């Protein structure tokens, strides 16, 4: 009927199968082991081989190379390596079944059902909705009955990420401020009725004196929205929450400090800060974690017009500070000035904001790990340890006064929204946000280098990666335990 993804490790005397693979070989009376031998060189990790008609039920059987059985935490790479081996291997195996146009697959748990489910649900995702020319939708299920809640924990974690990838990948004319708030809203309520959504309009934002955010949204005719999500997971309702904040620019053209044409279409994903944190709240609520979490996301477009922000303008943040808006394409800073002052209202335990903030983070680490600026090494350590697990790596960046300085010397105002130099572009923008944060446990995750995948993360196809939504979910899980 269907397909079957099966694993095997690198040599012992004979490279060894997963116990599911060994079982299946016994079931077809040694025929898998035999056809593997006839097919030639052994399967190294991530690689694939397909075998036809070994069993009446699995006419296509894909054997995937899982590398070393005992691969664990790598000190150099800072991740569990086995989990990463398995994500890439069952992603590759699953896409081979899909190219065979087979609608269903049974996936080998590979000794870690959670990492097996993450490779298949992440590796098979595309965002197909607007092409009439689509791939067969395959349905991936666990090959077995034994480790079920781990496999479904993987399905949970990976679907939390794929929500983010879909929120990001959708063209900005469909994923506007209102549309984004409405999809997150429904996704949060289906996850738990211990939720409340507030899709706050322009009049509220005005009443909230969020003039820095309003200054950015004015150039467009698309209405701003301030999204506020609550997941009431603690037994006591009066437990202080963990707050998440995210940049929600649904399209960044730069405005009057207009962007170059080349590849500005990827700016439809400049709400990836709001996608990532909102997907993790949806997944925390699905996981029904015993914690209270608020989700905050300013959503607007940044367009040029006869009423847009002009370079040089001084706008007042909620907290009374004035910002000189020297460059209109440093709008995340602005939107986040106001949303971060608002987070202190909730009396948080932790404030975590995420944002596709600077191209300089991309030049920096950009691609291999998201940069996290934190005044809390406790919080740094928490995110970093969750990162080992998920494999969706995080790397620390300096939150030194030296950078504050380059943003504090300012002609008309209290803070300038851009530094005098090109140097340390992501550290200066981090210094701008700290100006709007008094909290002792604050992390700023600059997600701009991890916005996209090409080939680097094996189990993700080309397009918006939804990174780092799983490191964020893992952090909340561990924080709740």
């Amino acid at each position: 009927t269907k397909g079957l993804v099966l694993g095997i490790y690198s040599k012992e005397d004979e490279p060894q199968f997963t116990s599911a693979g060994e079982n299946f070989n016994k079931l077809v009376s040694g025929k898998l082991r035999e056809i593997l031998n006839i097919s030639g060189p052994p399967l190294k990790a991530g690689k694939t081989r397909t075998f036809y008609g070994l069993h009446e039920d699995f006419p296509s059987v894909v054997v995937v190379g899982l590398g070393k059985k005992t691969a664990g935490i790598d000190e150099q790479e800072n991740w569990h390596e086995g989990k990463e081996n398995i994500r890439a291997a069952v992603a590759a195996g699953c896409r081979q079944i899909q190219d065979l146009e087979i609608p269903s697959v049974e996936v080998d748990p590979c000794g870690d059902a959670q990492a097996a489910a993450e490779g298949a649900v992440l590796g098979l995702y595309e965002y197909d909705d607007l092409k009439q020319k689509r791939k067969v939708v395959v349905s991936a299920k666990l090959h077995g009955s034994e480790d079920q809640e781990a496999w479904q924990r993987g399905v949970l974690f990976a679907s939390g990420q794929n929500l983010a990838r879909r929120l990001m990948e959708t063209p900005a004319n469909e994923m506007t401020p209102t549309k984004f708030a409405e999809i997150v809203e429904e996704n949060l309520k289906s996850a738990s009725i211990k939720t409340d959504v507030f899709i706050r309009p322009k009049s509220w934002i005005e009443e909230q004196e969020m003039g820095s955010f309003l200054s950015v949204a004015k150039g467009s005719e698309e209405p701003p929205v301030f999204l506020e999500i609550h997941y009431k997971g603690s037994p006591n309702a009066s437990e202080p929450p963990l707050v998440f904040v995210g940049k929600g620019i649904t399209f960044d053209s730069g405005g009057i400090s207009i962007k170059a044409a080349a590849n500005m279409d990827l700016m439809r994903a400049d709400m990836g800060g709001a996608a990532t944190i909102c997907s993790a709240i949806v997944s925390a609520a699905k996981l029904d974690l015993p914690i209270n979490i608020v989700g905050l996301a300013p959503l607007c477009e940044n367009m040029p017009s006869g009423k847009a922000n002009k370079p040089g303008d001084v706008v007042r943040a909620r907290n009374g500070k004035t910002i000189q808006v020297d460059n209109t394409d440093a709008e995340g800073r602005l939107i986040l000035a106001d949303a971060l002052c608002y987070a202190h209202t909730f009396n948080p335990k932790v404030i975590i904001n995420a944002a596709t903030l600077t191209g300089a983070m991309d030049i920096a680490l950009g691609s291999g790990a998201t940069g996290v600026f934190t005044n809390s090494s406790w919080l740094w350590n928490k995110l970093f340890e969750a990162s080992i697990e998920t494999g969706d790596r995080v790397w620390r960046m300096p939150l030194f006064e030296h950078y504050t300085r380059q943003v504090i010397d300012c002609q008309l105002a209290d803070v300038n929204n851009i530094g005098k130099y090109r140097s340390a572009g992501a550290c200066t923008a981090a210094a701008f946000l700290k100006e709007f944060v008094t909290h002792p446990k604050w992390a700023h995750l600059d997600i701009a280098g991890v916005m996209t995948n090409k080939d680097e993360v094996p189990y993700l196809r080309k397009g918006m990666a939804g990174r780092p939504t799983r490191t964020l979910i893992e952090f909340l899980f561990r924080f709740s335990q």
Binding site: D329, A360, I363, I418
Partner: peptide
């Protein structure tokens, strides 16, 4: 996204 500014550039650099």
């Amino acid at each position: 996204x500014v550039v650099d």
